[PDB]
Short mmCIF file of C-alpha atoms and ligand atoms in Angstrom, two decimals:
data_model
loop_
_atom_site.label_atom_id
_atom_site.label_comp_id
_atom_site.label_asym_id
_atom_site.label_seq_id
_atom_site.Cartn_x
_atom_site.Cartn_y
_atom_site.Cartn_z
CA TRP A 1 43.35 -106.49 78.12
CA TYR A 2 44.82 -108.93 75.65
CA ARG A 3 47.05 -110.32 78.38
CA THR A 4 44.43 -113.01 78.77
CA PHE A 5 47.13 -114.49 76.54
CA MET A 6 49.31 -114.79 79.60
CA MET A 7 46.36 -116.55 81.25
CA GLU A 8 46.39 -119.38 78.72
CA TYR A 9 50.14 -119.29 78.19
CA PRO A 10 51.82 -118.39 81.53
CA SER A 11 55.24 -119.10 80.03
CA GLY A 12 54.63 -116.26 77.61
CA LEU A 13 54.57 -118.51 74.56
CA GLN A 14 52.03 -120.65 72.74
CA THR A 15 53.31 -123.65 70.84
CA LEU A 16 52.14 -125.34 67.64
CA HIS A 17 50.80 -128.18 69.75
CA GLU A 18 48.70 -125.94 71.99
CA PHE A 19 47.61 -124.17 68.84
CA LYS A 20 46.16 -127.38 67.39
CA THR A 21 44.57 -128.37 70.65
CA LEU A 22 43.04 -124.94 71.21
CA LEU A 23 41.58 -125.07 67.75
CA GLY A 24 40.39 -128.66 67.90
CA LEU A 25 42.85 -129.16 64.99
CA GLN A 26 44.29 -132.09 66.90
CA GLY A 27 44.43 -135.53 65.28
CA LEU A 28 44.37 -134.62 61.59
CA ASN A 29 45.86 -136.96 58.99
CA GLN A 30 49.21 -136.48 57.27
CA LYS A 31 48.07 -133.70 54.89
CA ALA A 32 45.34 -132.06 56.99
CA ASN A 33 47.98 -131.83 59.71
CA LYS A 34 51.05 -130.80 57.70
CA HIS A 35 48.75 -128.02 56.45
CA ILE A 36 47.64 -126.85 59.90
CA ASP A 37 51.38 -126.54 60.54
CA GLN A 38 51.77 -124.33 57.47
CA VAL A 39 49.05 -122.12 58.88
CA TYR A 40 50.63 -121.93 62.30
CA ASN A 41 53.83 -120.93 60.66
CA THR A 42 52.51 -117.84 58.93
CA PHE A 43 51.63 -116.58 62.44
CA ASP A 44 54.91 -117.36 64.16
CA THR A 45 56.57 -114.66 62.10
CA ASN A 46 59.97 -114.71 63.81
CA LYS A 47 59.99 -118.39 62.87
CA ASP A 48 61.14 -119.54 66.33
CA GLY A 49 58.46 -122.18 66.75
CA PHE A 50 56.34 -120.33 69.26
CA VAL A 51 53.74 -117.68 68.98
CA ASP A 52 54.79 -114.93 71.43
CA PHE A 53 52.49 -112.10 72.44
CA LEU A 54 53.64 -109.87 69.55
CA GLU A 55 52.92 -112.53 66.95
CA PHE A 56 49.81 -113.34 68.89
CA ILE A 57 48.36 -109.85 68.67
CA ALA A 58 49.13 -109.67 64.97
CA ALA A 59 47.10 -112.83 64.65
CA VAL A 60 44.06 -111.68 66.61
CA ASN A 61 44.15 -108.36 64.77
CA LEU A 62 43.80 -110.31 61.55
CA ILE A 63 41.23 -112.67 63.01
CA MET A 64 38.92 -110.00 64.49
CA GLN A 65 39.24 -108.26 61.13
CA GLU A 66 35.79 -107.07 60.16
CA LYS A 67 36.96 -106.61 56.58
CA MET A 68 37.73 -109.70 54.52
CA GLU A 69 40.38 -108.04 52.41
CA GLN A 70 43.10 -108.73 54.95
CA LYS A 71 42.08 -112.31 55.56
CA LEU A 72 42.13 -112.87 51.78
CA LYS A 73 45.66 -111.49 51.38
CA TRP A 74 46.47 -113.97 54.10
CA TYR A 75 44.95 -116.97 52.37
CA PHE A 76 46.65 -115.75 49.25
CA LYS A 77 50.20 -115.59 50.64
CA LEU A 78 49.40 -118.87 52.34
CA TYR A 79 48.58 -120.56 49.03
CA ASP A 80 51.14 -118.68 46.94
CA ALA A 81 53.58 -121.29 48.24
CA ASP A 82 56.44 -120.36 45.93
CA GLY A 83 55.69 -116.73 46.84
CA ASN A 84 56.12 -115.64 43.21
CA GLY A 85 53.24 -113.21 43.71
CA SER A 86 50.99 -115.57 41.79
CA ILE A 87 48.91 -118.64 42.52
CA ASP A 88 49.37 -121.22 39.75
CA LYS A 89 47.10 -124.25 39.17
CA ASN A 90 49.28 -126.45 41.39
CA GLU A 91 49.31 -124.21 44.45
CA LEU A 92 45.55 -123.88 44.15
CA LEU A 93 45.36 -127.61 43.64
CA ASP A 94 47.02 -128.27 47.00
CA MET A 95 44.92 -125.53 48.50
CA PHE A 96 41.95 -127.66 47.47
CA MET A 97 43.62 -130.85 48.69
CA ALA A 98 44.15 -129.53 52.21
CA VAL A 99 40.55 -128.28 52.34
CA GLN A 100 39.60 -131.78 51.25
CA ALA A 101 42.18 -133.15 53.71
CA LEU A 102 40.40 -131.79 56.78
CA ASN A 103 36.97 -132.22 55.15
CA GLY A 104 35.59 -135.08 53.02
CA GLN A 105 34.75 -132.22 50.64
CA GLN A 106 31.58 -132.53 48.59
CA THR A 107 31.82 -133.27 44.86
CA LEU A 108 34.25 -130.77 43.43
CA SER A 109 37.17 -133.08 42.71
CA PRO A 110 40.33 -131.03 41.99
CA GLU A 111 39.89 -131.43 38.22
CA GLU A 112 36.44 -129.85 38.48
CA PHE A 113 37.31 -127.31 41.18
CA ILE A 114 40.56 -125.93 39.80
CA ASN A 115 38.89 -125.12 36.48
CA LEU A 116 35.60 -123.60 37.59
CA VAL A 117 37.77 -121.60 39.98
CA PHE A 118 40.10 -120.54 37.22
CA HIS A 119 37.45 -119.77 34.64
CA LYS A 120 35.70 -117.40 37.00
CA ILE A 121 38.72 -115.88 38.82
CA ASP A 122 41.50 -115.88 36.21
CA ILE A 123 40.45 -112.55 34.72
CA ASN A 124 43.23 -112.24 32.12
CA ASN A 125 43.40 -116.00 31.54
CA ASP A 126 47.16 -116.32 32.11
CA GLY A 127 46.60 -119.47 34.14
CA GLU A 128 47.53 -117.73 37.39
CA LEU A 129 45.37 -115.88 39.85
CA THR A 130 47.16 -112.67 40.77
CA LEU A 131 46.52 -111.06 44.11
CA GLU A 132 43.95 -108.90 42.30
CA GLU A 133 42.25 -111.84 40.67
CA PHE A 134 42.26 -114.04 43.76
CA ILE A 135 40.98 -111.49 46.27
CA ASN A 136 38.51 -110.00 43.82
CA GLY A 137 37.70 -113.42 42.43
CA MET A 138 36.99 -115.14 45.72
CA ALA A 139 35.11 -112.06 46.87
CA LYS A 140 32.51 -111.61 44.10
CA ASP A 141 31.88 -115.37 43.89
CA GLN A 142 30.84 -116.47 47.38
CA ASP A 143 30.58 -120.14 46.48
CA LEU A 144 34.21 -121.08 46.05
CA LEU A 145 34.82 -118.69 48.94
CA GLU A 146 33.49 -121.35 51.32
CA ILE A 147 36.12 -123.67 49.86
CA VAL A 148 38.80 -121.14 50.78
CA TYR A 149 37.30 -120.56 54.22
CA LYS A 150 37.32 -124.28 54.77
CA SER A 151 41.11 -124.14 54.43
CA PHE A 152 41.22 -122.10 57.62
CA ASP A 153 38.13 -121.57 59.63
CA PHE A 154 38.56 -117.93 60.62
CA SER A 155 35.57 -117.04 62.78
CA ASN A 156 35.60 -120.56 64.15
CA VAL A 157 38.85 -119.12 65.45
CA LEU A 158 37.23 -115.80 66.18
CA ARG A 159 34.56 -117.72 68.10
CA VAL A 160 37.13 -119.50 70.27
CA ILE A 161 39.33 -116.50 71.06
CA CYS A 162 36.32 -114.24 71.65
CA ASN A 163 34.71 -116.80 73.97
CA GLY A 164 37.05 -118.15 76.62
CA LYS A 165 38.59 -114.67 76.41
CA1 CA B 1 57.58 -116.77 67.28
CA1 CA B 2 53.12 -119.18 43.10
CA1 CA B 3 45.65 -114.18 35.54
#
């Protein structure tokens, strides 16, 4: 019964702070942190600052996802900062930054990364990965996919929920 949520959060609400703690994401630097906060936000849908059971379930549904399609749409909306339906070179840049902000990321330096990533994934070379390009791109190119994953360790998350559960 997913009211093992109530076990951890007797008040009925989980807060951004507990979130970080629960996920070890406590103590990050300015960027690595600010980012974790961006993540937490996408889950607290009713933007009230807490993650209540309803937002909570929506999150675990997405986490336990067996299929990666959903998780990718998630990373996509998450990086498509200006939500213009597209991910430009900047948004992806930051995306890389944050990954490199909570990881001393191995040689890939934005300059390098952003291009390799764009060459491969930017199918119609418009300079923007569409949802189609991004999902499909990241999918059939499991190399840069680990860079994405690094942004938000799903599974690490799945491990922790489906453990002390
Ligand atoms: Ca909320
Ligand atoms: Ca955009
Ligand atoms: Ca394109």
